[PDB]
Design a protein around this ligand. Structure first.
Ligand SMILES: CC#CCOP(=O)(O)OP(=O)(O)O
Ligand code: SF4
Length: 309
C-alpha cells in the first residue's frame, strides 16, 4: 500500500506561536499557568501542557487572583478581556495575529455604529471572540453560517453593512455564503474574498490534491478542530472515505484493508509527531515509505512576544 503525505499539513504560524507562548510562560514562571480555553484544539497538545502544569479553564472566574493567564490562539471577547483586566491577573495573549486582524475590523465597524455580519460556526471560540468585539447598541452584529441564514436575515440599515469571516472555514462553502450576502445586500463591504487564513486555504488545496490520488484520507486532528474537520469533509465530498483521528491508536484496520493508496494530512493544530506515529502504524498495516506530495511552500512565522523570549 502506498502512503502519500499532503503538503502543506500540520502546524500553522499562529498555532506554533501560541504553544510556544504557554511553554515559555511555564519555563519562565513555573506551574501553574492558567489558559483560557484549549490553547489550540488538539488533545495531545493540551494534555502535554496540562502534564507540565498548564491549567485550562473556560471562565475567568475559575482563575485565582495573582495568577498568570494566557488567552488561547482563537482569541477572546472584549468582555472576557475586560474581566481579566478588572481582576488581579498577569495576562499574555496568544491570539493569532490573523484573528486579531478580523477583530480590528469588527471594532472599527462598532465605533462607526455600522452593522456587521460574521460568517462562522455558532459556539466556536473564535466566533465568540470576534462577535465579542462589537459593542455599539446602535449598530448590530449578526452571525450567519449558510446561505439559508443570509436569506432569513434582516438588518437595520443595509446601505451601511460590512462582513467578516472566521479564519478556519471551508473556502468553497464560505464563497457560497458571500455570494448570497452580495445578492441579498448589494452595498455590503468586505475583504476581496474572505478572512480565511493562508494556512486554512493552503491545507484545503493540499488535501484536494491528496484526495485526487488517495482512496482513503486520514486527517490528524481533534474532533473540535474546525480546520481539521474541513479537511476531512473536503475529501469526503470528493467521494473518498476520510477519517478524523487523534492519533495512530484510532486507525481501524478495516479502513485500509485492500487499499492501494492511503493519504495522510494534519490540521493546523496537530503536531508532526502524531503524523509520524500514524505513518508508523500504516506501515505495520502494509504501507511502504511515506511519500510527500509537492506543495505550496509556506514561509510565515509569528514570533512570541518579547516579554516571553
Ligand atoms: C486559533 C487557531 C487555530 C487553528 O487550529 P485549531 O485550534 O484546531 O482551531 P480551529 O478549531 O479554528 O480550526
Ligand atoms: S489557522 Fe490561521 S488564523 Fe488560525 S492560528 Fe493558524 S495561521 Fe492563525
Amino acid at each position: 500500500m502506498q502512503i502519500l503525505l499532503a503538503n502543506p499539513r500540520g502546524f500553522c504560524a499562529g498555532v506554533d506561536r501560541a504553544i510556544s507562548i504557554v511553554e515559555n510562560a511555564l519555563a519562565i514562571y513555573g506551574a501553574p499557568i492558567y489558559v483560557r480555553h484549549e490553547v489550540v484544539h488538539n488533545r495531545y497538545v493540551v494534555d502535554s501542557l496540562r502534564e507540565r502544569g498548564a491549567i485550562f479553564i473556560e471562565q475567568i472566574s475559575e482563575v485565582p487572583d495573582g495568577a498568570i493567564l494566557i488567552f488561547s490562539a482563537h482569541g477572546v471577547s472584549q468582555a472576557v478581556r475586560n474581566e481579566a483586566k478588572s481582576r488581579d491577573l498577569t495576562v499574555f495573549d496568544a491570539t493569532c495575529p490573523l484573528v486579531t486582524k478580523v477583530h480590528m475590523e469588527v471594532a472599527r465597524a462598532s465605533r462607526r455604529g455600522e452593522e456587521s455580519i460574521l460568517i462562522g460556526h455558532a459556539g466556536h471560540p473564535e466566533v465568540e471572540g470576534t462577535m465579542g468585539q462589537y459593542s455599539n447598541p446602535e449598530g448590530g452584529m449578526y452571525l450567519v453560517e449558510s446561505p439559508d441564514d443570509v436569506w432569513k436575515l434582516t438588518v437595520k440599515n443595509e446601505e451601511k453593512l460590512s462582513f467578516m469571516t472566521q479564519t478556519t472555514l471551508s473556502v468553497d462553502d464560505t464563497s457560497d455564503v458571500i455570494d448570497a450576502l452580495r445578492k441579498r445586500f448589494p452595498k455590503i463591504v468586505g475583504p476581496r474574498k474572505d478572512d480565511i487564513c493562508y494556512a486554512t486555504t493552503n491545507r484545503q488545496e493540499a488535501v484536494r490534491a491528496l484526495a485526487e490520488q488517495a482512496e482513503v484520507v486520514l486527517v490528524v486532528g481533534s474532533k473540535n478542530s474546525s480546520n481539521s474537520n474541513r479537511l476531512a469533509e473536503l475529501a469526503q465530498r470528493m467521494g473518498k472515505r476520510a477519517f478524523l483521528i487523534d492519533d495512530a491508536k484510532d486507525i481501524q484496520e478495516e479502513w485500509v484493508k485492500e487499499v492501494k493508496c492511503v493519504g495522510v494530512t494534519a490540521g493546523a493544530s496537530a503536531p508532526d509527531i502524531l503524523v509520524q506515529n500514524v505513518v508508523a502504524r500504516l506501515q505495520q498495516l502494509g504501507g511502504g515509505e511515506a511519500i510527500p506530495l509537492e506543495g505550496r511552500e509556506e514561509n510565515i512565522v509569528f514570533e512570541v512576544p518579547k516579554e516571553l523570549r
